[PDB]
Amino acid sequence: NADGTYEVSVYTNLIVRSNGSVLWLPPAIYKSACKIEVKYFPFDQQNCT
Amino acid sequence: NADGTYEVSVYTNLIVRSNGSVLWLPPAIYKSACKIEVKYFPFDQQNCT
Amino acid sequence: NAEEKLMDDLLNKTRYNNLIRPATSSSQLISIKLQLSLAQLISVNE
Amino acid sequence: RVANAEEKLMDDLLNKTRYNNLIRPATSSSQLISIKLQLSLAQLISVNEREQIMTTNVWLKQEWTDYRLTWNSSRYEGVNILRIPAKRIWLPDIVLYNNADGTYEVSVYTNLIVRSNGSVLWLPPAIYKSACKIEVKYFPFDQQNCTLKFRSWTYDHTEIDMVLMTPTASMDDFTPSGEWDIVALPGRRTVNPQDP
Amino acid sequence: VQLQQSGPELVRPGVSVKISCKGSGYTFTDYALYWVRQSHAKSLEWIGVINPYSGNTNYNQKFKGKATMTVDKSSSTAYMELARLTSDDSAIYYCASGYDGYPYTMDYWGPGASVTV
């Protein structure tokens, strides 16, 4: 990511069932940092991870 | 540094062994301030401490 | 458990204070040692 | 052990069984706490015309009366005034509504002055990014009417009054901006009839 | 390190009395002086504390309207004056100098003067 904030700054609540199975789905937008292949501009594919 | 950000970001967990050795490896971003030798341009070495 | 007994034994408020530097006596130098591991030069704004 | 007069008096006033900073000093039901306020300007640091944001550091002086914070002065070795941090006593939450940020929160928590008869006075420092509309028909030979609108978000007129003390804001500590020229600073107390 | 006090005194009831305490062998400031009485039943009580650098006093609430505690930075000597002496005050009076830090104890003790009323 481009910033220094790794963790989620929201911290909502999460669901646990009678099995003991715990499910967590936090809301998040992420500012990921990927390199740009800019050779065939603007007819280009982009790979970002 | 240019900002007032001295300390470390997130304060992760750390590893302590039985002989008293404590090892801590936290992630940190730093905005260091260094001087720019700009006599040569754009073919230049940069010493930043 | 085994992990919970040790965690409570070692870090106890009557015997541990996270505000005192571990020195067996006075004028003892805690030899800390460090090395840096760079990951990325994200901007070298001039 | 050995304590001051102020430590003994501080332990007596802000006692957990007797003082609570979330209930207002009303001796009975439907009693209006008459507070009074008076703004003192310090500097016009900037007026950004493109984003319609003026920036001013002002000193709003506001005082009221709290009947829980009274003490006999001669009993505690003689202490007329007494200074306490702002988070530990009751205060009305007067803020701006026409600010450019979302910062309707209260400003920085400097401590406040309470006297012997309970007259509680508070003057927090704040720079404010007020939002005013720019009359830009004449240029650069223009007047600008930019307003500041103070109001309590929590309480209302059925619970607190809000009395203006002087009609004009005091200009005595004012340092000149060099770009703008204030010509008058009138303040008014606005209330809508047929709308309590 | 020595503390020196006055001798025993015979004072009729209703007359104020004054005893002294003069310390030598250490720097007289940066310590603090405690005054402790002791009756004939060896049950001993506390009277007051003075700071000889500033003169700030704190009295016991039993003895607020009686005792007056002063110092003297010339000869490094403290003076204690008791008023309203009754028959229940014939006791042994000690001055005791201790450091004003968190031990908060009586590091040194005087010989003790005898007040018989």
Add this chain to the structure above:
Amino acid sequence: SEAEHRLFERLFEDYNEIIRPVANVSDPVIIHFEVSMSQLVKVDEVNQIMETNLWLKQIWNDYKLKWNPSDYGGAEFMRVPAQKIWKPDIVLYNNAVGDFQVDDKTKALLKYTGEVTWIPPAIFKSSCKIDVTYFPFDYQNCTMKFGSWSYDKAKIDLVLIGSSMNLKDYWESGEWAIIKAPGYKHDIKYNCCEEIYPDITYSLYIRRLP
């Protein structure tokens, strides 16, 4: 150590952190005040602002946090957090961006006689005016007005340590050169209030390398 642990346990058992540290009441605390500059980040001539990195050395006495070294293993110095001790509100008056409170996460230093030494760092955005009537062969004068915010002249009396500002650990800029930086003390009376307030004013006389 073991003796420092017992002294730290004894030291903060019952410590009110909002009572001012004097043995008497009418006695004012005396706060020795000195500022050091690390670097001059920028002075925006366009926005009329000034960004500096400052270290605010504040030294005052405290009658309650003194102990005997001979009964605690010869320990003389302690490090306590700034969240537990009393600490004064030194606020610069001519600020232009942001909050006024200095950040309290750094630690203090307790000598055995009560001398508390607290060095917080801060970025400060002063709002000095600058004249560009000569350009770029100009000198500029920018002031910073440090002072206590709520306490009178009869409760907090500021005293400068030096007669100037410590440029001893100053990172060089390469654009601006600091000629001198004096420091003065004033006792002024405002028209809000009936009581005298002290302050300390640091001037800065700089020149552009043209």
Add this chain to the structure above:
Amino acid sequence: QIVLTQSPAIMSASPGEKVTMTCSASSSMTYMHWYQQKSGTSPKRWIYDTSQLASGVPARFRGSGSGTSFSLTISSMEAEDAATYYCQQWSSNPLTFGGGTKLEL
């Protein structure tokens, strides 16, 4: 505010015997000091911070306690250990001493 009470008032022991004295309080505290006065002379500082020893004190003694109960303990009784022991607290205004325990042979 806090009145101390010692137990027992008068006790005695033989040379080479374990001796236990108790000092009790009305409410709770954490740090309490112990003074020794002999016959005729002036008292001395003997134990501070509920467990520590003074300078000219032999290392046989041991003080311990917490809450509202404290105790002084003599492991090996000494021949010249005939004195009077007082317990005192400064943690509550005002400074109240103890009743006094007389230890004889």
